[PDB]
UniProtKB/Swiss-Prot annotation, chain D:
This is Small ribosomal subunit protein eS26A. Component of the small ribosomal subunit (SSU). Mature yeast ribosomes consist of a small (40S) and a large (60S) subunit. The 40S small subunit contains 1 molecule of ribosomal RNA (18S rRNA) and 33 different proteins (encoded by 57 genes). The large 60S subunit contains 3 rRNA molecules (25S, 5.8S and 5S rRNA) and 46 different proteins (encoded by 81 genes). eS26 interacts with eS1 forming part of the mRNA exit tunnel. eS26 interacts with TSR2. Transmembrane segments: none annotated. GO terms for molecular function: mRNA binding; structural constituent of ribosome. It comes from Saccharomyces cerevisiae (strain ATCC 204508 / S288c). The keyword Ribosomal protein applies. Residues 1-19 are annotated as: Disordered. The chain holds residues 2 to 98 of 119 of the full protein. Component of the ribosome, a large ribonucleoprotein complex responsible for the synthesis of proteins in the cell. The small ribosomal subunit (SSU) binds messenger RNAs (mRNAs) and translates the encoded message by selecting cognate aminoacyl-transfer RNA (tRNA) molecules. The large subunit (LSU) contains the ribosomal catalytic site termed the peptidyl transferase center (PTC), which catalyzes the formation of peptide bonds, thereby polymerizing the amino acids delivered by tRNAs into a polypeptide chain. Signal peptide: none annotated. Belongs to the eukaryotic ribosomal protein eS26 family. It is found in: Cytoplasm.
Swiss-Prot record, chain E:
There is a cross-link at residues 14, 45, 75 (Glycyl lysine isopeptide (Lys-Gly) (interchain with G-Cter in ubiquitin)). GO terms for cellular component: cytoplasm; cytosol; cytosolic large ribosomal subunit. This is Large ribosomal subunit protein eL30. Transmembrane segments: none annotated. PANTHER family: RIBOSOMAL PROTEIN L30. Component of the large ribosomal subunit (LSU). Mature yeast ribosomes consist of a small (40S) and a large (60S) subunit. The 40S small subunit contains 1 molecule of ribosomal RNA (18S rRNA) and 33 different proteins (encoded by 57 genes). The large 60S subunit contains 3 rRNA molecules (25S, 5.8S and 5S rRNA) and 46 different proteins (encoded by 81 genes).
UniProtKB/Swiss-Prot annotation, chain F:
GO terms for molecular function: RNA binding; structural constituent of ribosome; zinc ion binding. It comes from Saccharomyces cerevisiae (strain ATCC 204508 / S288c) (Baker's yeast). Gene3D superfamilies: Zn-binding ribosomal proteins. Component of the small ribosomal subunit (SSU). Mature yeast ribosomes consist of a small (40S) and a large (60S) subunit. The 40S small subunit contains 1 molecule of ribosomal RNA (18S rRNA) and 33 different proteins (encoded by 57 genes). The large 60S subunit contains 3 rRNA molecules (25S, 5.8S and 5S rRNA) and 46 different proteins (encoded by 81 genes). This is Small ribosomal subunit protein eS27A. The gene is RPS27A. Signal peptide: none annotated.
UniProtKB/Swiss-Prot annotation, chain G:
Present with 29600 molecules/cell in log phase SD medium. It comes from Saccharomyces cerevisiae (strain ATCC 204508 / S288c) (Baker's yeast). This is Small ribosomal subunit protein uS11A. GO terms for molecular function: mRNA binding; structural constituent of ribosome. Component of the ribosome, a large ribonucleoprotein complex responsible for the synthesis of proteins in the cell. The small ribosomal subunit (SSU) binds messenger RNAs (mRNAs) and translates the encoded message by selecting cognate aminoacyl-transfer RNA (tRNA) molecules. The large subunit (LSU) contains the ribosomal catalytic site termed the peptidyl transferase center (PTC), which catalyzes the formation of peptide bonds, thereby polymerizing the amino acids delivered by tRNAs into a polypeptide chain. InterPro entries: Ribosomal_uS11, Ribosomal_uS11_CS, Ribosomal_uS11_sf. Belongs to the universal ribosomal protein uS11 family. It comes from the Eukaryota. Signal peptide: none annotated.
Length: 25, 153, 214, 97, 97, 81, 127, 91
RNA sequence: AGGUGAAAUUCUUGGAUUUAUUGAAGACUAACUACUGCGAAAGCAUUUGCCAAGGACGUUUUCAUUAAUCAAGAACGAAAGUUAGGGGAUCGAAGAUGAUCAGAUACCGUCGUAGUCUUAACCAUAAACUAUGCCGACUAGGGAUCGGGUGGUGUUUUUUUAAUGACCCACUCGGCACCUUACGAGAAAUCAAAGUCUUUGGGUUCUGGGGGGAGUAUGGUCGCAAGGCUGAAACUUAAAGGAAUU
């Protein structure tokens, strides 16, 4: 697997972890 | 007071009688209360001045121009709007010009074309903010506001 | 179908009196119709050609003199000087490599208050001693070429219009005027004025209209 | 690993300068770090050249030329163009042939 | 250079900033310079132009400003007309303009 | 390389290199004694000079600022040292 | 003293414009392209295409009577291949092989300042 | 005691309406209020005397500029073109 | 006709493609364009006025330790991405689809919004590269190449010995890359620095330590957001990585 594809897969699940995180603000 | 640009009383001591009738040449984003203006097909291309398009060039910007050489000014009279020229013709006088309706129309090279746009840099690009400057807004226009909804009644 | 060959009048075109042979070449306007005679048909046409076949020496097989038809005289379209140009084919022919291209521009008015703009092209060459494979300049010298090219051009013009100015353009007397002040500086090869364009001319003046007929 | 002096091509101590897109597959890349070759094409070709001079008007004419400048993309320029993959020290090669 | 001339004669020269004083220096006979830039009213200077021929003095119309002609006089204040009285250092009586 | 003597110098490497790389600092230039046609007094000047050295009563600028040695006119005498 | 004019023939990729005009240019004479003889399109800027191209323009120039023509051919110029038609020069091989006085041979393909972006970009058009 | 971090002359619009809206406000507000330079004197001491005008206190000549700014992005590229034609017909 | 390897799309009796006469916004600065420039970096190639700056060297110039490199800090910062005024000329994420093969979101086709650039200001990040730190002296030759200093009734020039500019010649400090081996070093590759490191210390900025997990959890500070610097641990596993060889 290309490193840019692996770097973005986690960038999306990192911005997505800011979403389920908005459930505590 | 009721429009959206500095309209001026352009004085003329009358070319046939001694009485100064301050005629009226609309707003130009680049003038001052004290300009030695010239109007007529034989004047200079200085903003404020004016001559028929048979004395002007391809790609010029002016205001209060007549679609019918004499209307005193129809096209080119808006806060932040202008009129460029897209073509010309020495015979028949068919100088094509740029109007914001997304299209362009042809005029005659004898219509009075007063150099310069109407003053008012970016009005619909600086919000009402509150219906306040919005109520005092329709104050000098028409009671078309407030506008209700159809699905409603 | 109408086979326009009929309304395809095999006309003809010639030169003025400022050149040598008043023969340029035949053309095809359109047969005289209703409210479109064979005088005020086109008139805005042009004659683009190398001044070699326009004169008599194949040394000038380069450079293309630009003309524009005025109106018809003797059922033979005349012509007049609208400007001078350089062959696009000879432009890429004079460009070698390992050098520097020195160009310049300048707007000028004539005596008849004619608005044109003479330019000037320039290529670089070595010296009868140099061993260098380039022959570049310290820029402050190429920048001096621009203040000297415009100096020359706008010092002799503003007189006799392009009638006498074009009378010196063709015999390329400027190639020895450019290489005149440059002789005391850098050698330079080729050296020509390239282009120049005219667009600020009034309307049809019957005056210089018969000055083309001879 | 790294096999070349100014890797790219004469790319040393400057960076972004002025690039020119490829005049083949439209593959863009810097002019001073790619590859370029002058085109010395006459006017016609090598076969019908004699038949054109026979019909040529004017005393044999002077006959001018039409030059040009090429720009390659590297990837396609190696498909079967100018390259053919070279050897080690013969890589330092900066000679015409 | 017009920069060198200005700098020197204004850091050691007898001058007069102003309409009255320019009119007073004019109706004295010891003023040979009066430079007004393009932004200041040339009307006040119209009497000075009608007085240019009356004062016989050699004027000069600088293509700049009296805020840039302020750097020329010294303070970042406002001064459209610079009228030279008596020589104190340099003599722009004859320059490259 | 191997062996030499940077203790005893030569006249060849004394008129070729910079005094700032040899063994001691020293100007490769000099001053001059140039006069003008009509000066019955004295005139001592520099080499490159930089700034232009004028005259006495008939100031006709002896030399002007040059990248090389302050050039002299047709009314002067290049007097070395 | 001849019957002058200017060929101004064109030759791009996937077609070859084989026609002549006059020294003025504001009037052309004939058009006839090479794919008009070939009903396959597979071979458009092909060799016999240009041959048959200057074949349809050969007898039509014999109708006007013009012979001395200052040709101004072209590749594609503008901002595309910048390369002349592969088999589009076979049009000169058939018009001279039939008869037509040629002289003042030149070109007018305008080269850009790389101004308007070309159709390719960084990664380009790699297939 | 500047009672602002990122609001300025817009804090007078508190929590009502919205941030985004009031943001752009302060933009041309400042490029209208501020004593604009009167080129009819080179001395900047002229503010906005009603929509589209700049009342000058330097010869007291009122000025014709912009609705907020003294020259919008549009009438700017236009300042250029009129200058261009001027000379061509000049001499 | 535009177009590909050939197709299809599409534009075409509503005369586009076609060459010629003035135009225009928007864009660019071509070919010369180089083992070269100058700039702090990022980079930034047309002309001229203005603004001033830096610089090599010139100098028997003025100072007299002014000094030397950086944690937190402080200016610019290409390009993507941004808020909005001016902005889509082309190309053109996305999209729309025509072929392709069992299938194709894609590559190849045409068109096409964001984007493309600007005004004052944000996100301060990249293979931002010399994957290789700054300076003060030394260890090699030639020069490729620029700025510069010298002498030459040297080359070229003719106006008129003067003024003369440029080219030629060894030399040549600050610059920019290369060649031969390497005295040295280096895992090798290779390097006038990766030499001057077991014979290890000239002042100093910084970071790295088997790799996954993971530049992810947390929080702080910055920013509008995307996201930036940031920074875990358990658990797992005995291989992984690099040079170079067959």
């Amino acid at each position: 697997m290309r490193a840019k594809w692996r770097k973005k897969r986690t960038r999306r699940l990192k911005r997505k972890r800011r979403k389920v995180r908005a459930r505590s603000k | 007071s009721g429009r959206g640009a500095p309209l001026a009383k352009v004085v003329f001591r009358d070319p046939y009688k001694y009485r100064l009738r301050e005629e009226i040449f609309i707003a130009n984003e680049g003038v001052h209360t004290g300009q030695f203006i010239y109007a007529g097909k034989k004047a200079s291309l200085n903003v404020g001045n004016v001559l028929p398009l048979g004395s002007v060039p391809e790609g010029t910007i002016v205001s209060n121009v007549e679609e019918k050489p004499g209307d005193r000014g129809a096209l080119a009279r808006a806060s932040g709007n202008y009129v460029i020229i897209i073509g010309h013709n020495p015979d028949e006088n068919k100088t094509r010009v740029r109007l914001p309706s997304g299209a362009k129309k042809v005029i005659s090279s004898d219509a009075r074309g007063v150099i310069g746009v109407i003053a008012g840099g970016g009005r619909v690009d600086k919000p009402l903010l509150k219906a306040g400057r919005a109520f005092h807004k329709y104050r000098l226009k028409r009671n078309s506001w407030p506008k209700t909804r159809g699905v409603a009644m | 179908v109408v086979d326009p060959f009929t309304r395809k009048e095999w006309f003809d075109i010639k030169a003025p009196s400022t050149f040598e042979n008043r023969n340029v070449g035949k053309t095809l306007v359109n047969k005289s119709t209703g409210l479109k005679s064979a005088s005020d048909a086109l008139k805005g046409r042009v004659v683009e050609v190398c001044l070699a076949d326009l004169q008599g020496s194949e040394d000038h097989s380069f450079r293309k003199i630009k003309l524009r038809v005025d109106e018809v005289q003797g059922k033979n379209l005349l012509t007049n000087f609208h400007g001078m140009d350089f062959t696009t084919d000879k432009l890429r022919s004079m460009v070698r490599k390992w050098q520097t291209l020195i160009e310049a521009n300048v707007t000028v008015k004539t005596s008849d208050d004619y608005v044109l703009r003479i330019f000037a092209i320039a290529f670089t060459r070595k010296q009868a001693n140099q061993v260098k494979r380039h022959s570049y300049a310290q820029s402050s010298h190429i920048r001096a070429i621009r203040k000297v090219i415009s100096e020359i051009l706008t010092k002799e013009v503003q007189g006799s219009t392009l009638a006498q100015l074009t009378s010196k353009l063709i015999p390329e007397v400027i190639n020895k005027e450019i290489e005149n002040a440059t002789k005391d500086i850098f050698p330079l090869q080729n050296i020509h004025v390239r282009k120049v364009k005219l667009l600020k001319q009034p309307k049809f003046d019957v005056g210089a209209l018969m000055a083309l007929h001879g | 690993p790294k096999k070349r002096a100014s890797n790219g091509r004469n790319k040393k101590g400057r960076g972004h300068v002025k690039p020119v897109r490829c005049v083949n597959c439209s593959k863009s890349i810097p002019k001073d770090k790619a590859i370029k070759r002058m085109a010395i094409r006459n006017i016609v070709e090598a076969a019908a050249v004699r038949d054109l001079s026979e019909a040529s008007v004017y005393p044999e004419y002077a006959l001018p030329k039409t030059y040009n400048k090429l720009h390659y993309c590297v990837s396609c320029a190696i498909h079967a163009r100018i390259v053919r993959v070279r050897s080690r020290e013969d890589r330092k090669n900066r000679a015409p042939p | 250079s017009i920069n060198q001339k200005l700098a020197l004669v204004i850091k050691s020269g007898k001058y007069t900033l102003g309409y009255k004083s320019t009119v007073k220096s004019l109706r004295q006979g010891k003023s040979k310079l009066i430079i007004i830039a393009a932004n200041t009213p040339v009307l006040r200077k119209s009497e000075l132009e009608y007085y240019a021929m009356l004062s016989k003095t050699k004027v000069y119309y600088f293509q700049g400003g009296n805020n840039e002609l302020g750097t020329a006089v010294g303070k970042l204040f406002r001064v459209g007309v610079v009228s030279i009285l008596e020589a104190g250092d340099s003599d722009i009586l004859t320059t490259l303009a | 390389v191997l062996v030499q003597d940077l203790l005893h110098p030569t006249a060849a490497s004394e008129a070729r290199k910079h005094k700032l790389k040899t063994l001691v600092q020293g100007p490769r230039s000099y001053f001059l004694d140039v006069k003008c046609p009509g000066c019955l007094n004295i005139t001592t000047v520099f080499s490159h000079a930089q700034t232009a050295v004028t005259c006495e009563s008939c100031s006709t600028i002896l030399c002007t600022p040059t990248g090389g040695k302050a050039k002299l006119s047709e009314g002067t005498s290049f007097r070395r040292k | 003293s001849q019957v002058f004019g200017v060929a101004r023939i064109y030759a791009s990729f996937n077609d070859t414009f084989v026609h002549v005009t006059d020294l003025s240019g504001k009037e052309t004479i004939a058009r006839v392209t090479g794919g008009m003889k070939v009903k396959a399109d597979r071979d458009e800027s092909s060799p016999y295409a240009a041959m048959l191209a200057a074949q349809d323009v050969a007898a039509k120039c014999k109708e006007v009577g013009i012979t001395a023509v200052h040709v101004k051919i072209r590749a594609t110029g503008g901002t595309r291949t910048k390369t002349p038609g592969p088999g589009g020069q076979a049009a000169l091989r058939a018009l001279a092989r039939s008869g037509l006085r040629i002289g003042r041979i030149e070109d007018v393909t305008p080269v850009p300042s790389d101004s308007t972006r070309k159709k390719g970009g960084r990664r380009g058009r790699r297939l | 005691a500047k009672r602002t971090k990122k609001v300025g002359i817009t804090g007078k619009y508190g929590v009502r309406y919205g941030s985004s809206l009031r943001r752009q406000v302060k933009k041309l507000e400042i490029q209208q209020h501020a004593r604009y330079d009167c080129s009819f004197c080179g001395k900047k001491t002229v503010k906005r005397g009603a929509a589209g005008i700049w009342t000058c206190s330097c010869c007291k000549k009122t000025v014709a500029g912009g609705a907020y700014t003294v020259s919008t992005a549009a009438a700017a590229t236009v300042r250029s073109t009129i200058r261009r034609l001027r000379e061509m017909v000049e001499a």
